[PDB]
Design an enzyme around this catalytic site. Structure first.
Site, PDB file in Angstrom:
ATOM      1  N   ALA A 234       7.201 -34.556  46.960  1.00  0.00           N
ATOM      2  CA  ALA A 234       5.986 -35.163  46.383  1.00  0.00           C
ATOM      3  C   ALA A 234       6.368 -35.970  45.138  1.00  0.00           C
ATOM      4  O   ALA A 234       7.412 -36.618  45.099  1.00  0.00           O
ATOM      5  CB  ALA A 234       4.990 -34.067  46.114  1.00  0.00           C
ATOM      6  N   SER A 235       5.531 -35.910  44.105  1.00  0.00           N
ATOM      7  CA  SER A 235       5.661 -36.798  42.964  1.00  0.00           C
ATOM      8  C   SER A 235       6.929 -36.669  42.126  1.00  0.00           C
ATOM      9  O   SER A 235       7.192 -37.524  41.288  1.00  0.00           O
ATOM     10  CB  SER A 235       4.423 -36.661  42.090  1.00  0.00           C
TER      11      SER A 235
END
Ligand code: DH4
Length: 498
Positions: A234-235
């Site tokens: 993810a981020s």
């Protein structure tokens, strides 16, 4: 006859014994047996099971009592054998692993390697963690009876037991994984998978009752989530993706894009911020963990040139951590997708990957590696547990063979990607500003939420000149505390106590 060598010990950075050898004393007509009953407290069970060791284990009392009656028993002697002991048990189950009984399977394997003579007198073998990866260095050369066995080399890990316990405490009841690392060395200060189990259950030999417990446990404790856990990063990936886009010149230090909280495929993709961040450079897109901005950069860079650059950060690749239990996850490519799924690569596959989602899977260790790289301005470090090896009573230190570099160290692309993370923690628009409220040190972080959603945080400190980095994930969110909360607590513990 073969003399089994003493297994080398395993120690934390400050020489704290983590794996030990405990002496087990053993005794070895049917008249003789009844005569021993008063002298060693030989029970009806110890004679029944004895049907070679007559009584095990003997207690120093029972030994000393037999020792004075040695003359009244012919040929019968007391034998000091050794068993691995794991003081801190569940705290290190994954990193230290464990030795377990050698079965006829482990035999076959030793046979074809032509080292079975070395394990002639040896009963237990390294089956997990450091015990497995360093089994060779930990076993030693076998001796003969009198040519003395060369005792297994001691292994000094870069682990900090204090920290390692402290993390396990913080991850209680949460399926989670943490990898603290000294980014200056590559040294793993802590490597924690929750839930764990007692490594000691395996030393004697694990009951199929006990194993089928660990095996069939919903929470899957057997898995080292730090190195074998495949999660959408993810981020957390955004800072590296940022640096890659700058190096590829697909964006620049100041590259204003407007976010409406949406981005459609020129088929829409929702930013976390429902009504967007507005006018975004990379520095702000990182600070605020803007999806829209990275959704775009994914499209501009395109799968092949993005995949390539992440492969340089070591995503989809084995980190070269000294553990045999590791997954490489997947940095997806067209080549891969075609082979794997037998369908070609669509553009709607490049967008998810732009925010460390989609086919992209990573191991906390992979995430921990990529951060160290970003910290050292592209001078890659291999995550290593081994700190030094006792070779002829000398501590010989770990020396990295991988000299790898990516792009130019002097490129101010790392400084901006890092500065973004500086923002994620210190600046008011930052995602993790809440968690680093009034840090004596200056911390840099990149939060992340995958797909209940996994909660991820890579982070390092002191930003000014860093000596710690963390990669924490709490599978399906934290059991209770936020990933950012724990990252603070971990950075507190190391940097306040330093
Ligand atoms: C990064 O991965 C970013 N995008 C994640 N998602 C898209 C929006 C829907 C929520 C879950 C998937 C996330 N980064 C986290 C973070 O904790 O840093 C957010 C909340 C900024 S969104």
């Amino acid at each position: 006859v073969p003399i089994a060598p003493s297994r080398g010990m395993i120690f934390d950075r400050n020489g704290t014994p983590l794996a030990l050898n405990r002496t087990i004393y053993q005794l070895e007509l049917s008249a003789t047996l009844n005569a021993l009953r008063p002298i060693v407290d030989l029970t009806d069970d110890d004679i029944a099971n004895f049907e070679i060791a007559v009584k095990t284990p003997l207690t120093e009392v029972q030994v000393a009592r037999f020792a004075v009656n040695q003359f009244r028993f012919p040929g019968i002697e007391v034998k000091g054998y050794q068993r691995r002991f794991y003081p801190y048990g569940s705290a290190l189950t994954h990193v230290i692993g464990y030795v377990s009984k050698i079965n006829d399977k482990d035999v076959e394997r030793l046979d074809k390697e032509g080292i079975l003579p070395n394990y002639a007198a040896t009963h237990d073998i390294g089956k997990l963690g450091i015990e497995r990866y360093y089994e060779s260095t930990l076993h030693g050369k076998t001796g003969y009876e009198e040519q003395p066995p060369q005792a297994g080399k001691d292994i000094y890990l870069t682990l900090d037991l204090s920290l390692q316990i402290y993390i396990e405490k913080l991850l209680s009841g949460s399926r989670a994984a943490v990898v603290v690392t000294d980014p200056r060395t590559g040294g793993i200060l802590a490597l924690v998978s929750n839930p764990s189990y007692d490594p000691n259950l395996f030393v004697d030999g694990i009951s199929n009752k006990d194993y089928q417990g660990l095996l069939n446990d919903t929470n899957r404790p057997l898995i080292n989530r730090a190195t074998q856990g495949v999660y959408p990063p993810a981020s957390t990936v955004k800072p590296y993706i940022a640096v890659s886009a700058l190096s590829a010149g697909v964006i620049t230090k100041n590259t204003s894009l407007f976010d409406p909280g949406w981005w459609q495929l020129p088929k829409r993709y929702r930013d976390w911020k429902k009504w967007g961040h507005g006018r975004l450079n990379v520095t702000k897109a990182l600070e605020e963990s803007a999806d829209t901005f990275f959704y775009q950069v994914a499209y501009d860079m395109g799968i092949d040139r993005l995949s390539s650059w992440m492969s340089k950060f070591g995503y989809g690749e084995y980190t070269g951590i000294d553990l045999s239990e590791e997954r490489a996850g997947l940095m997806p490519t067209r080549e891969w997708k075609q082979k794997r799924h037998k369908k070609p690569w669509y553009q709607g596959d490049t967008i998810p990957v732009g925010i460390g989602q989609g086919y992209w899977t990573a191991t906390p260790i992979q995430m921990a590696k990529s951060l160290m790289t970003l910290i050292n301005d592209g001078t890659v470090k291999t995550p290593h547990l081994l700190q030094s090896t006792r070779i002829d009573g000398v501590l010989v230190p770990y020396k990295q063979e991988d000299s790898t570099q990516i792009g130019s160290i002097n490129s101010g692309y790392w400084e901006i990607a890092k500065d973004g993370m500086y923002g994620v923690a210190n600046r008011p628009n930052g995602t993790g500003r809440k968690f680093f409220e009034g840090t004596p040190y200056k911390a840099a972080a990149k939060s992340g939420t995958a797909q209940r959603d996994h909660k991820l945080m890579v982070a390092f400190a002191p930003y000014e000149n860093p000596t710690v980095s963390v990669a924490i994930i709490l599978e399906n969110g934290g059991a209770g505390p936020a990933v950012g909360t724990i990252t603070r607590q971990i950075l507190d513990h190391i940097l306040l106590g330093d």
